[PDB]
Amino acid sequence: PPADGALKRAEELKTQANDYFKAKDYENAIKFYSQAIELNPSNAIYYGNRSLAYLRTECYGYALGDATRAIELDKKYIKGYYRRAASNMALGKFRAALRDYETVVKVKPHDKDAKMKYQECNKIVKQKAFER
Amino acid sequence: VKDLVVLLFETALLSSGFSLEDPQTHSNRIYRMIKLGLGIDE
Amino acid sequence: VKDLVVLLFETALLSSGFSLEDPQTHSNRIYRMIKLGLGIDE
Numbered sequence: 001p002p003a004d005g006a007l008k009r010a011e012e013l014k015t016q017a018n019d020y021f022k023a024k025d026y027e028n029a030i031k032f033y034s035q036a037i038e039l040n041p042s043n044a045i046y047y048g049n050r051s052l053a054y055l056r057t058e059c060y061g062y063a064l065g066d067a068t069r070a071i072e073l074d075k076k077y078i079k080g081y082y083r084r085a086a087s088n089m090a091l092g093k094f095r096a097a098l099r100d101y102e103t104v105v106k107v108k109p110h111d112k113d114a115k116m117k118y119q120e121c122n123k124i125v126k127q128k129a130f131e132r
Numbered sequence: 133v134k135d136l137v138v139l140l141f142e143t144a145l146l147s148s149g150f151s152l153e154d155p156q157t158h159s160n161r162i163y164r165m166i167k168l169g170l171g172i173d174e
Numbered sequence: 175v176k177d178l179v180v181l182l183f184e185t186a187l188l189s190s191g192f193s194l195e196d197p198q199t200h201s202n203r204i205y206r207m208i209k210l211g212l213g214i215d216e
Binding site for chain 1: 211212213
């Protein structure tokens, strides 16, 4: 226990739907994640991936639920950190995402796209604060 | 736009030697951002 | 510390019935402050 069949099914559904998302087949990837989770509910990567897909479809509540469940699975899922920080940035409650990216750059500073995103978001939040 | 325009107009009123009638109104507007200067208002 | 304290001094000076000696410098300080708050630079 656990049997190899469920693990293989979850892995193959993950690989299939990753291939489909490389072709941007969102609904198919969503259904294959759903089936795999029904077979294996302890995989946080599915939570993060459907979170990101929902952001591209702009359904934030489902994405944040997935992020919360993933963090309850593994507290230090860095990909989930990036995903739900970007989710909050796309929502508007800037401070939590700001703290997330500050912690990430404090622990991992050698990332270029993240640093440019952080600085541009920082000008964003400064303008939002000043404008009132 | 309302905030910025009234701010710039009231500042311009001082620029020509005119004296305002309600200095509290402009003093509040100048104090409103110095608190953002050090950050957390609340 | 110095520009902050002189800014507070002059603002209390204006909102107390006195008259400033050089409004142009005043307006300049507020203009640069609002510009930098807008993050224009260069």
